[PDB]
Paper text:
Pseudouridylation is the most common RNA modification and is observed within tRNA, rRNA, ncRNA and mRNAs. Alternatively, an RNA recognition mechanism that does not rely on guide RNA factors is employed by stand-alone PUS enzymes that independently recognize and modify their targets. More recent data have suggested that PUS1 is the predominant PUS to modify uridines in mRNA. The structures illustrate how PUS1 recognizes and binds a helical RNA duplex and enable the identification of RNA-contacting amino acid residues that make extensive contacts with each RNA strand to orient and guide the RNA into the active site of the enzyme.
Residue numbers in the entry:
A (entry chain A), B (entry chain A): 71 to 116, 123 to 219, 222 to 253, 266 to 464, 484 to 495
Write the structure that this text describes.
RNA sequence: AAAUCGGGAUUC
RNA sequence: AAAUCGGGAUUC
């Protein structure tokens, strides 16, 4: 029976194929794989006496950095390498550091950094023929919304390319069939047109302003589930929002943007709902200030963005580092790993994101469902409600 | 580039932790693990040119025997052992046999055997205090339903045991707390009382009659989803139904029964809905003949039983064996493996079922939700509807 | 966080 | 078969 010390473990993972961070049998989770590696490496033996997590990343949500707290066997001086050898390629342990007895992953978390990877073709306007396009274009009863000749040019180049290859065969419905093969090739051509799209500087600036609409303290009751507008804990403080320059990655050469959000605390699916709302405001040509209207008591249903693009970048423990460094305890700083994670993120997270995006068309499917859906549609009009 | 022959592969698996049989990235499925083992063993290289499955077992559904058809590399005389070495312990390949070019897993499937493992305490009447118990007992407006002094004795022995250990503390609501620990121990005592239950011969005979209500050809539109009563394909033929004698298995010594259903063809979630309906009829004390009323055009919502207890025992290919044996092709008979599967079923399927039942309380949670739910409730009364 | 029961709108 | 968007009733 070896001794056990209460330590914090810094880890990172691609969340694809796992049912979130929190241990939840019988479905594979990040924590179940971590525990299997711990047992196979000698970190634990045989509730797990004080187990703790900093963030319960949802189904499919990745994390460049996450932390847990537990009583481990630190006797092996090469225990980290053993655990990493016993782990799958998509999960890694960055470090192991001793913590004080009163350490609490969640209560000592001062802030959180999140990153969302979004394909730039998500900001193209809805396809002509969709209900959202019909309702937005037919919003000439109040001539407020942008014109967005860029999306018009994209869709019309797609129409010219389709017509120069599918001589009025003209796909209409389907529910192992030569028709289906024809349709398959049309949708593949449309996806290829999406992948060749390069966002303009104006659309990027518009999206940056729409995301900047989130800075400061706001009532985010519409950006979660089961939160009342009058609840005081519905107010959240976003410290910073940064939208990266566009960047091309992958064999299909598809364009992406990185959205880093630093906030004091977040509610369930807050990041994805914010991202989705900013994307809809940008791609529909609405005044970005309308995002602030979402803070009102009127309830709006914001469909959360796909989990595939979400990464928990790092939890932050400001008070712990500032007020417990005199006790000899090492500070918890994920940036000390920043380069290593940066490699892992590119090799085992971002690559998975690009592969699943080009294989299953996650983002385009999400936005095609939004496009064809008869609360949010009203908000994205020229006229909202009140 | 090795040659490839079109073969059929006989496999078995525990479905826990997998998203069904059909290959469906990015979530792990039985077929994705099979393909990984195939690649690692040399069975395939690099749609999969004619891939076929006999049955698309749902999420969590096991199978003592399932079959697939594909073009494999059969050059290795020890290819089966290599694939099995490359497979996890919960998935096994029983055999590989050559098939004719026109072979079609699903179209040549003449019938199907299914097995459902049900804990006998699922047949105990609803707990006094539940809405279902209140509605059934208060069905004295039409004095039709059984009395079931056995369930009364069970619940009253539980009440005597609880009161002799929890002196009117008396748990009332909860939503890390000493109360919760008390409640935890009450529910554990109730679960232990359930695990010690041994079904009487009368209840077993009643359940056997309720299941026999399914024999022959019937309209099973209520025993699936999205099937209209007037659709001719809503009629299904059950060739045989056998309920095994009760048997005790596991460390907690819990009692189980095996329900084997041989049918020509089945609709989506038909087995689980039939099982659930028979169980409700038995545990509520209804005339078993009322099950035939479910074949009427009136729509009833039958909650499907947990997937944990379902096994696809074997698909059957009668016509293929009878009309293609002269062509030199070996018959496809899963019974030729019956002993081997029988070991695997006990070591990697039934054991998982018992462990998950005693760890997560799947069946009792399902029936506790049924018990407290304000269409089916009306059917389980003395008065149905019409 | 995850899972269940159903009901509604979609996706090779 | 699986997956998505939501809405409703539940489960350490
Ligand atoms: Cl999350
Ligand atoms: Cl199934």
């Amino acid at each position: 029976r070896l001794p056990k010390r209460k330590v914090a473990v810094m880890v990172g993972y691609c969340g694809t194929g796992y049912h979130g961070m929190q241990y939840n049998p019988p479905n594979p989770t990040i924590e179940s794989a971590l525990f299997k590696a711990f047992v196979e490496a000698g970190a634990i033996s045989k509730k797990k006496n004080g187990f703790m997590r900093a963030a319960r990343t949802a189904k499919g949500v990745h994390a460049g950095g996450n932390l847990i707290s537990l009583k481990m066997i630190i006797e092996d001086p090469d225990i980290k390498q053993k655990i990493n050898e016993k782990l799958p390629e998509g999960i890694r342990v960055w470090d192991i550091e001793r913590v004080n007895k009163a350490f609490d992953c969640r209560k000592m978390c001062s802030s959180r950094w999140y990153e969302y990877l979004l394909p730039t073709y998500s900001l193209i306007g809805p396809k002509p023929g969709s209900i959202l396009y019909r309702d937005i274009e037919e919003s000439k009863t109040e001539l407020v919304l942008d014109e967005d000749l860029e999306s018009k040019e994209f869709w019309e180049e797609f129409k010219k390319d389709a017509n120069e290859k599918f001589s009025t065969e003209e796909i209409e419905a389907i529910l192992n069939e030569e028709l289906y093969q024809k349709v398959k090739k049309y949708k593949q051509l449309e996806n290829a047109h999406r992948r060749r799209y390069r966002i303009s500087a104006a659309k990027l600036a518009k999206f940056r302003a729409s995301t900047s609409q989130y800075l400061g303290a706001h009532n985010f009751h519409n950006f979660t589930l089961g939160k009342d507008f009058k609840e005081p804990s519905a107010i959240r403080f976003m410290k910073d929002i940064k939208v990266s320059d566009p960047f091309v990655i992958g064999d299909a050469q598809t364009e992406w943007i990185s959205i880093k959000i630093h906030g004091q605390s977040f509610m369930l699916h807050q990041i994805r709902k914010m991202v989705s709302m900013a994307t809809l405001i940008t791609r529909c040509g609405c005044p970005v200030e309308r995002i602030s209207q979402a803070y009102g008591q009127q309830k709006i249903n914001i469909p959360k963005a796909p989990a595939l693009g979400l990464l928990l970048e790092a939890p932050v423990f400001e008070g712990y580092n500032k007020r417990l460094e005199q006790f000899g305890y090492k500070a918890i700083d994920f940036s000390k790993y920043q380069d290593e994670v940066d490699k892992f993120k590119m090799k085992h997270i971002y690559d998975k994101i690009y592969k699943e995006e080009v294989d299953e068309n996650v983002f385009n499917a999400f936005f095609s469902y939004i496009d064809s859906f008869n609360k949010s549609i009203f908000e994205f009009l020229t006229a909202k409600g009140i």
